[PDB]
Amino acid sequence: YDSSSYVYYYQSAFRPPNGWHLHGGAYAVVNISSESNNAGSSPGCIVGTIHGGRVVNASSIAMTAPSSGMAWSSSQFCTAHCNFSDTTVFVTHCYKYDGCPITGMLQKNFLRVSAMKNGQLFYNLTVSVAKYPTFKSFQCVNNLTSVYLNGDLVYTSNETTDVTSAGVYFKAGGPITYKVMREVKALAYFVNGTAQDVILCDGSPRGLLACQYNTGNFSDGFYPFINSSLVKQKFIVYRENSVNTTFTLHNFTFHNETGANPNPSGVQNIQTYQTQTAQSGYYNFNFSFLSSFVYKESNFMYGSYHPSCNFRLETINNGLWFNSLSVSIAYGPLQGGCKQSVFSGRATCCYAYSYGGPSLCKGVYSGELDLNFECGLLVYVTKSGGSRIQTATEPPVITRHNYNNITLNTCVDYNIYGRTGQGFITNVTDSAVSYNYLADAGLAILDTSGSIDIFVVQGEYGLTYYKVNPCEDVNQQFVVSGGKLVGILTSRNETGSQLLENQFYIKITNGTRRFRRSITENVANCPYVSYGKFCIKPDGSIATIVPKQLEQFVAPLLNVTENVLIPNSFNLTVTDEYIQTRMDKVQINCLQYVCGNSLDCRDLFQQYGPVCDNILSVVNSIGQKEDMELLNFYSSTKPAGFNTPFLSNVSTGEFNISLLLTTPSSPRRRSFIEDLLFTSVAYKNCTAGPLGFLKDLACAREYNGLLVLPPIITAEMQTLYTSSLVASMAFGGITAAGAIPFATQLQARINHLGITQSLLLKNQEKIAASFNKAIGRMQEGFRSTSLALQQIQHVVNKQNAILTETMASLNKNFGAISSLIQEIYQQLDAIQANAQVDRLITGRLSSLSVLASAKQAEHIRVSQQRELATQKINECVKSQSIRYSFCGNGRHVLTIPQNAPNGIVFIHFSYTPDSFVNVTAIVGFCVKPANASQYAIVPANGRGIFIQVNGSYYITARDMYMPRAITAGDIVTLTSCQANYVSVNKTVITTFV
């Protein structure tokens, strides 16, 4: 915090916890200046000498050292004083030579921060060299006249006096730095209660995000903002009168006169000893009746009756809008003036001022008119809400100027009809002189939230219609991607070198001036930040997105004879996905979360009975409903036991799958790929002993009453689940004799697409080379462009962001006076504090309601993905069904599951070949036999269309080019053929002897 752009300044000796927090104080810099080696011919600066000043008349000063270098010993540091107009402040490590009465020549001694007037000394305090290890900085601040040896306070007094000089003695060391400063707002991230860095509100593009959204280390995505700045041509449109007017406001005056007698018994017998009225235009009301006239606050009988007129009498002169107005003063009684003279009287509402009056006043009320009361003057006001007359103080400056010249299409200030805004104004009267766009009462149209959408103006050849829309920066955005700021996505064109979809784009200069314009590059998939056919990298430059797709084929559908394309060779294209399957159960302890560790707050809480039952029952229900069918999910899919490690030194044939399964040398039972998944992201003793940076938030949670519960499947019972599942996928089948742990399963699962089982010595190394290329693309794919990794990222960030906002909802006070509850009862009254405490407790229980509802919605999400998970485990892993492109964009071969952060990660293996052959095809036969008969042969279902090669005839499967002689069980005999055949004269059944 001792950089060349700001000086830190600790806010008064306490520290709020780990996180960003805002302050306001003298933090900036202006006129940085250096100085070094202010010593004479002596080998060390002598202690106690106050000389060596430097005249600076500024509103601050700061003497800063290099980063923790200047020790307190001899030949290194001396007095380093300011001075005010009369009083001084000087530090002195006065170790003994002969001079001061301290008598110590060592460390572990004290200091002397002491003020000094013209002749004498006072305020000796002696802070130790402990807690102040090394001289870092030294300020002197104008307001409150306080002085700051590095960080906290050492001395305040009464005055408000600016700095006049400063100066430091030292023999050698770092070159010291003098700097003066102004006062801005800033906020400082600090962990453990000591400042690391600050963010200033200096109008920088990095600063405005922190200064408006009260945070740093921001998430990725979009963020809107503002920067209000306008000194341009303002224009005012006043309310036009009939014709030929100079807008002159009338002045209605009042004065207490030599009034008459107080009233007799009747409430109609009180006479208004003034009368005024409002007709049109503008007015102001000179009330000189604040002179020794108290205001009487309304209560059950006496006082004012200002309900139905929310303004108070000394606030009429601001901009209001009435429809008819008439005020008058009247000297009646006080206890029943307004409460009777509003209902049965002649005014909408009335006020009741008072003074020192004689107590001979006959009051007005039914049945109580025989006493003697006070006589304070009561004013009347007959308000009718509307828009005909407007009350204002200053005279309107448009003096004989009919509205001919007001600006259009420029970002101006406007004050039209007493409602201040900031936007620009178009001309829309071409579409509005038709469609009777306003009725016979022509003034503005309010939209919602009290602004103006369309107003009128009068004075030209014909009346027009103007529309008000806000300026160019009403919604600017700037894109962040990953960890840092990239550029402002605005609506204006400040030579913006890039156009996105319906928005203009600029880019902030990072160091060098270049790298502003380039040719866009085509990206397959990007997870960074995506915005409408355009993708933004953390480098800063955009790159347009265009999705790829892979080929597929269903090709044999055969009419009249023509050659067809069926594959001979084949490849495997991997595809991943992630499905969530678990949830952390919570347990809200409402009594310890709402109130702190106090003796009180609990007796006030014990009439909030059933709301803790309501906040507890839904959490208990979702906990039980998750915990039962989680064990159902574990008992439906855990195959047979198979408690065998299978730790990937098992000799397979030619399939390098040891990349994908677990290793012998690891402290946790973990393979390589889910270790790569884990590096992108319940037994403790919370009393003593930390573990990590993120796992040790459990002690901050348990000390506020948000604790977790272990699942019904225990820890180290799920790390055997994945290994047992792949062990049942591999070993299931063979009797473990003949080097077949993983290969034979794959070859006997790949020939189900055609129609054979477990063929040898053909299609054995082709599968090996194809699967080796597939796992090569797989080990390339995870680190840069995959599908599972960003899903892992979004799920982990949402699961963390649910609970970390209902912990930071504690310092957020509700409608109240403070946040903590220990010092509400100490500042104010007893029976007035209970409303504050009730508001705060109701707010915190509302926050727990939000937590429980979010947890139930997330439970519905995870139960959905868990039943999809048990369906995909039951089908894609152990079955190999023929459902086309259920899992992995094609007719799938095999899957292998792996562990994840609270889920499972699949690896699907598709079947998409590309290399084809060109072979002639035919659709049927009709052989005629010898004596008398006729039939046809059509290829049956599930055995594929049949082809010919160089004279002979062969059937084949629809996916693998595998010629084979036609047998007797693949025929369909039909008594028809219609010249779309071959018609061999001899039989082609090829039966046997």
Ligand X SMILES: *[C@@H]1O[C@H](CO)[C@@H](O[C@@H]2O[C@H](CO)[C@@H](O[C@@H]3O[C@H](CO)[C@@H](O)[C@H](O)[C@H]3NC(C)=O)[C@H](O)[C@H]2NC(C)=O)[C@H](O)[C@H]1NC(C)=O
Ligand Y SMILES: *[C@@H]1O[C@H](CO)[C@@H](O)[C@H](O)[C@H]1NC(C)=O
Ligand Z SMILES: *[C@@H]1O[C@H](CO)[C@@H](O[C@@H]2O[C@H](CO)[C@@H](O)[C@H](O)[C@H]2NC(C)=O)[C@H](O)[C@H]1NC(C)=O
Binding site residues, ligand Z, CB under 6 A: 50, 53, 55, 83, 88, 101, 121-122, 124, 164-165, 189, 191-192, 196-197, 216-217, 653, 690, 692-693, 738-740, 743-744, 760-761
Nearer to its own copies, 8 or 90 (CB): 8
CA distances from 349 to 30, 255, 279, 322, 908 (A): 58, 21, 20, 14, 79
Query: What pairing do the DSSP bridges indicate for beta strands 250-253 and 281-286?
Result: parallel
Secondary structure, 3-state, 374-413:
CCCCEEEECCEEEEEEEECCCCCCCCCCCCCCCCCCCCEE
Q: Of 182-190, 355-363, 835-843, 862-870, which part binds ligand X (CB under 6 A)?
A: 355-363
Q: Pick from 138, 141, 145, 130: which is nearest to 168 by CA?
A: 138
Q: Which does 644 bind (CB under 5 to 8 A by kind): its own copies, ligand Z, ligand X, none?
A: none
Convert 381-400 to b/e letters by CB count within 10 Å (16 or more is b).
bbbeeeebbbbbeeebeeee
What is the crossing angle of helices 609-637 and 830-872, to 10°? 10
Q: How many CB atoms lie within 10 A of CB 265?
A: 11
Radius of gyration of the chain (CA): 44
- Does the protein bind ligand Y through residue 493 (CB under 6 A)? yes
CA 866 and chain centroid, separation: 29
Instruction: Give the contact letters, 676-715, x = binds to ligand Y (CB under 6 A), - = no.
Output: ---------x-xxx--------------------------
Nearer to ligand Y, 253 or 510 (CB): 253
CA 554-555-556 angle, to 5 degrees, is 105
Which position among 258, 502, 597, 985 is part of the footprint of ligand X (CB under 6 A)?
258
CA distance 373 to 285: 30
Q: Which residue has the tokens 């002195």?
A: 92
CA distance 587 to 917: 64
Q: Which does 443 bind (CB under 5 to 8 A by kind): its own copies, ligand X, ligand Y, none?
A: its own copies
CA distance 278 to 284: 10
- Does the protein bind ligand X through residue 692 (CB under 6 A)? no
Minimum CB separation of residue 398 from its own copies in Å reads: 20
- Does the protein bind ligand X through residue 357 (CB under 6 A)? yes
Which position among 28, 47, 56, 325 is part of the footprint of ligand Y (CB under 6 A)?
56
Minimum CB separation of residue 553 from ligand Y in Å reads: 12
Which position among 90, 95, 285, 331 is part of the footprint of ligand X (CB under 6 A)?
331
CA distances from 377 to 126, 227, 257, 358 (A): 65, 51, 11, 12
Q: Which does 43 bind (CB under 5 to 8 A by kind): its own copies, ligand Y, ligand Z, none?
A: none
Minimum CB separation of residue 154 from ligand X in Å reads: 55
Which position among 19, 66, 104, 259 is part of the footprint of ligand X (CB under 6 A)?
259
Nearer to ligand Y, 833 or 921 (CB): 921
Which residues have CB under 8 Å from 662's CB, separation 6+? 645, 646, 647, 648, 669, 670, 671, 723
Q: Which does 57 bind (CB under 5 to 8 A by kind): its own copies, ligand Y, ligand Z, none?
A: ligand Y
- Does the protein bind ligand Y through residue 784 (CB under 6 A)? no
Outline where 239-392 has alpha helix (H). Answer: 337-341
Size of site (CB under 6 A) for ligand Y: 44
State phi, psi for 14 to the nearest 5 degrees: -110, 160
- Does the protein bind ligand Y through residue 229 (CB under 6 A)? yes
Q: Which of residues 900-959 bind ligand Y (CB under 6 A)?
A: 914-915, 918
DSSP state of 76: T
- Does the protein bind ligand X through residue 262 (CB under 6 A)? yes
CA distance 438 to 365: 50
Q: Which of residues 130-189 bind ligand Y (CB under 6 A)?
A: 142-144, 158, 180
- Does the protein bind ligand X through residue 580 (CB under 6 A)? no
Q: Pick from 977, 979, 976, 968: which is nearest to 940 by CA?
A: 968
Minimum CB separation of residue 734 from ligand Z in Å reads: 9
Instruction: Give the contact letters, 461-490, x = binds to ligand X (CB under 6 A), - = no.
Output: xx-x--------------------------
CA distances from 314 to 290, 295, 306, 480 (A): 9, 11, 13, 50
Which position among 133, 264, 319, 395 is part of the footprint of ligand Y (CB under 6 A)?
395
- Does the protein bind ligand Y through residue 649 (CB under 6 A)? yes
Nearer to ligand Z, 173 or 216 (CB): 216
Q: Which does 685 bind (CB under 5 to 8 A by kind): ligand Y, ligand X, ligand Z, none?
A: ligand Y
Minimum CB separation of residue 17 from ligand X in Å reads: 23
Q: Which residue has the tokens 């235009």?
A: 281
Could you tell me if 556 and 958 are in contact, meaning their C-beta atoms sit under 8 angstroms apart? yes
Q: Which of residues 395-454 bind ligand X (CB under 6 A)?
A: 408, 427, 429-430, 433
Q: Which does 375 bind (CB under 5 to 8 A by kind): ligand Z, its own copies, ligand X, none?
A: ligand X
Nearer to ligand Y, 253 or 426 (CB): 253
Nearer to ligand X, 106 or 260 (CB): 260
Could you tell me if 21 and 188 are in contact, meaning their C-beta atoms sit under 8 angstroms apart? yes
Minimum CB separation of residue 799 from ligand Y in Å reads: 29
Q: Which does 930 bind (CB under 5 to 8 A by kind): ligand Y, ligand X, its own copies, none?
A: none
Minimum CB separation of residue 836 from ligand X in Å reads: 42
Q: Pick from 365, 348, 27: which is nearest to 187 by CA?
A: 27
CA distance 98 to 47: 10
Q: Which does 310 bind (CB under 5 to 8 A by kind): ligand Y, its own copies, ligand X, none?
A: none
Nearer to its own copies, 130 or 445 (CB): 445
* Token representation of residue 134: 């090394």
CA distance 207 to 184: 12
Q: Which does 88 bind (CB under 5 to 8 A by kind): ligand Z, its own copies, ligand Y, none?
A: ligand Z
Q: Which residues of the shown chain bind its own copies in the complex (CB under 8 A)?
A: 10-17, 323, 385-388, 438-439, 441, 443-448, 453
* Token representation of residue 407: 């600006």
- Does the protein bind ligand Y through residue 770 (CB under 6 A)? yes
Could you tell me if 633 and 582 are in contact, meaning their C-beta atoms sit under 8 angstroms apart? no
Minimum CB separation of residue 291 from its own copies in Å reads: 36
DSSP state of 39: -
- Does the protein bind ligand X through residue 789 (CB under 6 A)? no
Counting Cα atoms < 13 Å in the Cβ hemisphere of 425 gives 26
Which position among 375, 535, 824, 977 is part of the footprint of ligand X (CB under 6 A)?
375
Q: Which does 53 bind (CB under 5 to 8 A by kind): ligand X, ligand Y, ligand Z, none?
A: ligand Z
Q: Which does 387 bind (CB under 5 to 8 A by kind): ligand X, its own copies, ligand Z, none?
A: its own copies
One-letter identity of residue 169: Y
Nearer to ligand Z, 197 or 447 (CB): 197
One-letter identity of residue 923: V
Q: In 3-state terms, the chain is what percent helix, strand and coil (to 5)? A: 15, 25, 60
One-letter identity of residue 968: A
Q: Which does 740 bind (CB under 5 to 8 A by kind): ligand Z, its own copies, ligand Y, none?
A: ligand Z
Q: Of 565-573, 618-626, 702-710, 822-830, which part binds ligand Y (CB under 6 A)?
A: 565-573
Interaction site with ligand Y (CB under 6 A): 31, 33, 55-58, 142-144, 158, 180, 203, 205, 227, 229, 248, 251, 253, 286, 288, 395, 488, 493, 495-496, 563, 565, 569, 571, 647, 649, 656, 658-659, 664, 685, 687-689, 770, 773, 914-915, 918
